[PDB]
Amino acid sequence: NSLFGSVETWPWQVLSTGGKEDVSYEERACEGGKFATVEVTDKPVDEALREAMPKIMKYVGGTNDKGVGMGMTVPVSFAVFPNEDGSLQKKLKVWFRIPNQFQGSPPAPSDESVKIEEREGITVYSTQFGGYAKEADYVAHATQLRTTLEGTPATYQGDVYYCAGYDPPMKPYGRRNEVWLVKA
């Protein structure tokens, strides 16, 4: 006797949404899927980002442990840790989202600098805004959400936030922006 069979799905469930006018927040649960992230310390967000940029590209580029030659297209997001001065100085963690096309069975990490790990059991707040959004905007919206979420049991640590974006546009014109806030 013998048999087999399984599935593969990581849907996200929302607990509730809302917030103040202009800017709204959304509480969702981490799907728990596997993603490729990198760790960069002793370097500024500018260095850690410029260093991780190519580090993550090497994976999807073809430098995989399994030697898979397919390719994936998706926006990458990294975490940041603001300080009392507003400057992001401490640590930087890059997160590369993988498309369902690869999620079905992504290749192993050819390098240690970037490994595929999954994160689940965390609750963050998503806030989307339109109009001209510059680099500083992302840092401002992060704190703006804090006061906007006022009157709620929602907690935070260091006001840490995440930045999601496809690629750096030749101009500051940021029509689309994304900022996630991990509740403490």
Side-chain angles (χ1 to χ4, degrees):
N1 200 52
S2 57
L3 251 149
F4 237 95
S6 317
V7 287
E8 213 101 329
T9 45
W10 49 103
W12 74 83
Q13 245 87 257
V14 68
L15 49 119
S16 169
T17 59
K20 215 223 114 212
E21 213 126 303
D22 237 54
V23 59
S24 260
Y25 50 66
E26 167 156 6
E27 305 131 90
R28 55 140 61 175
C30 246
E31 44 246 290
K34 72 222 67 168
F35 311 96
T37 161
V38 313
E39 63 229 316
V40 194
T41 69
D42 249 67
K43 265 114 76 96
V45 175
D46 245 59
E47 289 278 7
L49 177 73
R50 96 185 229 79
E51 285 296 89
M53 242 61 257
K55 166 178 300 186
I56 282 297
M57 106 184 272
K58 90 202 279 201
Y59 180 44
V60 48
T63 322
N64 331 72
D65 206 344
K66 267 296 236 197
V68 176
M70 252 215 132
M72 42 267 250
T73 345
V74 125
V76 63
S77 65
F78 65 103
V80 285
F81 309 116
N83 279 301
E84 71 189 21
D85 225 52
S87 320
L88 311 324
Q89 248 251 56
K90 248 271 196 81
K91 284 100 76 155
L92 176 149
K93 241 201 270 95
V94 184
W95 277 92
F96 190 65
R97 167 175 176 197
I98 301 143
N100 315 122
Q101 286 153 83
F102 256 87
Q103 303 245 234
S105 166
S110 224
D111 228 89
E112 72 187 301
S113 247
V114 48
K115 318 227 66 246
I116 290 288
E117 320 225 84
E118 44 257 89
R119 277 201 162 175
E120 76 103 335
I122 71 112
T123 300
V124 303
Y125 318 97
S126 98
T127 177
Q128 239 144 232
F129 44 94
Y132 223 100
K134 234 211 289 240
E135 270 127 82
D137 207 15
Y138 284 72
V139 178
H141 275 95
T143 291
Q144 236 77 316
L145 223 59
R146 248 234 54 190
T147 180
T148 301
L149 288 137
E150 275 165 346
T152 76
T155 38
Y156 323 88
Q157 58 240 320
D159 223 311
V160 49
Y161 60 106
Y162 300 88
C163 298
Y166 252 110
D167 34 53
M170 183 162 112
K171 262 78 139 288
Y173 211 138
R175 56 186 82 76
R176 182 191 284 281
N177 323 111
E178 269 183 310
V179 190
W180 297 1
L181 274 173
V182 51
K183 77 184 199 176

